[PDB]
Structure 1
């Protein structure tokens, strides 16, 4: 009297609308009792052939496992193929009906979903993070065996309970769009890597999370580690000039600045001891605060930071979640960091203000822009479909967030701005960036529609290699196309029709 396991059916993963993303499909595995095989040696060659194995090597393996009562022949054949071997009636050959995961969207959502074991245990991404929920509990079968031991099947001791279903926050339609457009952007620019995150400003849901390179989890032969990283969550980078709107939020909240205030940025450089702060465009003197963002003046943002102090900038960044724990619990997710100082020297103050010295994830950057677009209120992040929205936390004053939103709409819409971020039919807001690593990261971060925001988006492209490499040239056009499609796919009313 012994017990054999009764495999449980692992729960289905779907996207937010119910589209299957991970399904456990019936699969047959074959094992043998060598002691029973040792009584039917003349059958071995035909069985070896039916397993695509060499007869002599196969025979060797059963001889050297002769004294054992159990060994695997092969795992995870199709039910019809496993019937082929079962049909040739070899003594001591048995079958086990297991389940095997299939991923219908393949590489399009591989980084979010992850994958399972040969045992159908989650070992990456969502499959790992929600493993206890999805797994269910295997059963126990009471079985009688003779002293060979040939099994000669009594009753179910304990039933199998299937795993529970799970609906992600991801919208597969948005995911496909983002994937295709990020991929196109990568190839066109000779880029090495990239991330794109799309977030629902009002509910905290991650509507799309896509990276390049990626991999097809359905093929065990193409699990190459470098292409398996969910870069949006597990890789960090200096956000660069994409953090300037949060510097600006500190300035406006300080009570010392308004959008119409002027800063003098001539001659487009500022010498701070050994360190020189430099702008790309150096034919400006007086700029207002909206102008500082539109032209992305480093000198301008540094002078404001000197006036208000680094501490005020650090707290806005901390509050919005940059370099902080997101609390999602995605496997291998990084926290990043905001630097700290007892006393902040000028050079450190300036570099913070325009996005160096700190390290963030793409998901953190998108979460920060989402809170800004949601009138300064940060809704907790979710990877699962949200039906009842949790209470959000006020992180920037509504009034300040509104002003900064307007300024950002101007960076997209005014002359001298990131016109390639413009979304046909809609008002859009955002900020470009280009950070060093002569290697660069091209960036665009933003949200839309400007009159009542719905979606925040970050596009991060690593090391473009074709002439133009600024965030406004490389990443902005991706924001434009993906945002255009996402908006209409979500049936959001156009707010900039003529």
Structure 2
């Protein structure tokens, strides 16, 4: 062709990601894709070796590259490059060589908030995390310019900007970067001190459904993905599922206290620390108990004790409460890869299955779902829908546990933390805190769990700590996960200026 008119799209400035307070988490930065028309390059061949030397490329490899695709009017010398480099090569004055301002994501907080934020690909398109989930919102409208081109394809003149580019829109996350840094630091230190393989920490606003912090280990630097494992990129809080074990006994207890058949001072005999359901044997971890009250059952995490309560009230009431607090249910966060886990239902709940559900096995949940459950319980039985985006207008919650029952369970979990034989390492200096330890087995390999909230008497914050496969001789949730809860809850309450309730 003697001439032709071609589409070139005006790229959009991709929307700024901030934290709830406007700290920048993902920032669109000027770069420049050095490109070339081979057809024009093919008539300045003595200029190539210098060009190559400034693209650092091998002289003969470069020249082979330009040769093979001589016909094409387009080739990328580099993708991205500062508006600095890009000029250093423009000032060469090589025929068929140009620079064109692009946008590249920078992530100022780096590894600290990688799983939540995720990242864009070579093309400034969301690929993981918030970047993908909210791509539409963040990506603007590419505009369009009609350009007249000579025989070779060199832009002679620009005819019209027919439709300008529209910038993408700012997104403010629920994340509080200050809590996120603290959670990140303490989860990393807890892994080191226990030689654990992995972990997750979630902090929630029990009043707004906002995720204030979501950190996992291992993590990666999104600014430098060069050499990086598939494992280190798992948002484990959202896309990994586990058996919550003893951390859902409190929901089994909500059911019990809602049935009308149980009150806290009621007694269950759990002797001799085991119980046969035909060929199946329920085993307590500790087996030096006969009579325990309902608080003791939680303090001892007695599987026998919670199974006998379950046989009494029925699996249906237990299933119903766990369903309503959202365990194994769709959170509606539309996070890429986000799991729903499994809350298995039954027409006929047999005995074995009644017991396993009640003591926290046979179901699988995310750390985010468990945090959300603990939020509902902390917010006086009222579940607010989860959000990763800042909540200005808090939606109506659903009352999923009676306020009075919620209040009783709150008081019992405060005792689990504060009473003799309790999870004393979960205590939070000059606050009342409430919560529940858990330990799962997966050749002994543990998952170590703590879920709780504070302040105990007027809750603000729900927190889950999950440490995968601690390596020292301590593996119990109350040993491994509780101290991280203590430290990160104490920090979060201070940072949000929450009044101490233990004076």
Provide the TM-score with structure 1 as the length reference: 0.99
Q: CA deviation at 1:281?
A: 1.7
1:121 aligns with 2:142: no
Distance 1:465 1:274 in 2: 33
Q: CA deviation at 1:253?
A: 0.4
Q: Secondary structure at the match of 2:155?
A: coil
Query: Which range moves more in the overlay, 273-282 or 306-315?
Result: 273-282
Q: CA deviation at 1:222?
A: 3.5
Q: Secondary structure at the match of 1:77?
A: coil
Q: CA deviation at 1:220?
A: 2.9
1:461 aligns with 2:491: no
Q: Secondary structure at the match of 1:109?
A: helix
1:368 aligns with 2:351: no
Query: Which range moves more in the overlay, 227-236 or 270-279?
Result: 270-279
Q: Secondary structure at the match of 1:177?
A: helix
Query: Which range moves more in the overlay, 216-225 or 284-293?
Result: 216-225
Cα deviation, 1:5-64, whole Å, max 9, x if unaligned, reads 211100000000000000000001111011111110000000001011100000001111
Q: CA deviation at 1:342?
A: 2.5
Provide the TM-score with structure 2 as the length reference: 0.98
Q: CA deviation at 1:3?
A: 2.7
Q: Secondary structure at the match of 2:115?
A: helix
Distance 1:95 1:143 in 2: 16
Q: CA deviation at 1:467?
A: 0.3
Q: Contact between 1:215 and 1:222, CA under 8 Å: does it hold in 2?
A: no
Equivalent of 1:12 in 16, 20, 28: 16
Cα deviation, 1:206-239, whole Å, max 9, x if unaligned, reads 0000000011110130442111110100010000
Runs (5+) with no aligned partner, structure 1: none
> What's 1:221 paired with?
226
Distance 1:320 1:496 in 2: 28
Distance 2:460 2:260 in 1: 29
Q: Contact between 1:168 and 1:384, CA under 8 Å: does it hold in 2?
A: yes
Cα deviation, 1:56-103, whole Å, max 9, x if unaligned, reads 000001111111211111110011111111111101101111100000
Distance 1:162 1:5 in 2: 13
Q: Secondary structure at the match of 2:203?
A: strand
Runs (5+) with no aligned partner, structure 2: none
Distance 1:299 1:3 in 2: 71
Query: Which range moves more in the overlay, 145-154 or 373-382?
Result: 145-154
Distance 2:490 2:54 in 1: 54
Distance 2:404 2:362 in 1: 29
Cα deviation, 1:77-130, whole Å, max 9, x if unaligned, reads 011111111111101101111100000000111101111021101111111111
What is the aligned length?
A: 497
Segments ≥4 residues shifted beyond 6 Å? none
Q: Contact between 1:216 and 1:222, CA under 8 Å: does it hold in 2?
A: no
Q: Contact between 1:318 and 1:324, CA under 8 Å: does it hold in 2?
A: yes
Cα deviation, 1:382-407, whole Å, max 9, x if unaligned, reads 11000010000010000000000000
Q: Secondary structure at the match of 2:226?
A: helix
Q: CA RMSD in A?
A: 0.9
Distance 1:420 1:11 in 2: 43
1:479 aligns with 2:488: no
Q: Secondary structure at the match of 1:363?
A: helix
> What's 2:137 paired with?
133
Cα deviation, 1:405-459, whole Å, max 9, x if unaligned, reads 0000000000000000000010000000001112110000000001110000000
Q: CA deviation at 1:133?
A: 0.8
Q: CA deviation at 1:283?
A: 1.4
Distance 1:220 1:182 in 2: 22
Distance 1:367 1:445 in 2: 10
Distance 2:63 2:159 in 1: 33
Cα deviation, 1:277-324, whole Å, max 9, x if unaligned, reads 111222111111111111111111111111111111110111110001
Distance 1:66 1:448 in 2: 68
